[PDB]
């Protein structure tokens, strides 16, 4: 499972 706080700039729902 990715840690979404690795890079706050990354939105996982975004393509």
């Amino acid at each position, epitope marked *: *499972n*990715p*840690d979404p*706080n*690795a*890079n*706050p*700039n*990354v*939105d*996982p*729902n*975004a*393509n």
Partner: antibody, heavy 120, light 114 residues
Framework: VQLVQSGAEVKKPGASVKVSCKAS????????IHWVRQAPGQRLEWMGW????????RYSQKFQGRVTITRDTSASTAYMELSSLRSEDTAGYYC??????????????WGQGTMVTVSS | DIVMTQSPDSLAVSLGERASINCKSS????????????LAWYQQKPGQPPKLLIY???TRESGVPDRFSGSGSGTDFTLTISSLQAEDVAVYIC?????????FGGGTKVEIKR
């Protein structure tokens, strides 16, 4: 969108350096600013990031002791401080907006980077 | 830490020839939920910051020429330059953003044979 960094410097071993990074062209509080170092003949090393809004940070273990990243939102600028400098730390240093994958857009901006030489 | 391993270290092909760069992840970085690989590909010319080329392992960053493309899942990934131009001489770096800390590949140097 642009990040302009501070000038090259030499620092004596065991001393401290603090590189600046000014942001322009967007809402400074909206994005996280990263710092990555590149030492000659060595891969890119991520050092840490700071959310420019609430000033929350996250650091790397390899530098966790001696690194300090801060932002002055009034001046739209982020700062990174290495302490207890050694010879390993002679390297180029970058502030970066790494892989901002937003819904609307996707972009990746880096400063011109700043070289720090640790020497007597 | 997730370790990014690239092969080869160096490459040289003729102008117009195909170049292929493998990056292997030391831990799977595909998220089965959204079916997204959390990998980026970069290019670095001398005296310049790295420029981003691919993200989500296969999405070209806008502006980037079509001769660059990315592929692979899980732990194994390739960057493909279909027809090397003389300006493509650079170091290429894969990058994972699955986990802290963010890590980079060692970089592959493409050269021109002429």
């Amino acid at each position: 969108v642009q990040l302009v960094q501070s000038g090259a410097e030499v620092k004596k071993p065991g001393a401290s350096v603090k590189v600046s990074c000014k942001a322009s062209g967007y809402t400074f509080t909206s994005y996280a600013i990263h710092w990555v170092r590149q030492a000659p003949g060595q891969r890119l090393e991520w050092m840490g990031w700071i959310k420019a809004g609430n000033g929350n940070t996250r650091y790397s273990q390899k530098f966790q002791g001696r690194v300090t990243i801060t932002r002055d939102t009034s001046a739209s600028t982020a700062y990174m401080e290495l302490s207890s400098l050694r010879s390993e730390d002679t390297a180029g240093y970058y502030c970066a907006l790494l892989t901002v994958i937003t819904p609307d857009d996707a972009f990746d901006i880096w400063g011109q980077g700043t070289m720090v030489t640790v020497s007597s | 830490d997730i370790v990014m391993t690239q092969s080869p270290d160096s490459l040289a092909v003729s102008l117009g020839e195909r170049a292929s760069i493998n990056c292997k992840s030391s831990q799977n970085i595909l998220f089965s939920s959204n079916n997204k690989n959390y990998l980026a590909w970069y290019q670095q010319k001398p005296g310049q910051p790295p420029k981003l080329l691919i993200y989500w392992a296969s999405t070209r960053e806008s502006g980037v020429p079509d001769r660059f493309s990315g592929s692979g899942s899980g732990t194994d990934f390739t960057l493909t330059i279909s027809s090397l131009q003389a300006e493509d001489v650079a170091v290429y770096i894969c990058h994972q953003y699955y986990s802290s800390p963010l890590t980079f590949g060692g970089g592959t140097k493409v050269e021109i044979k002429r």
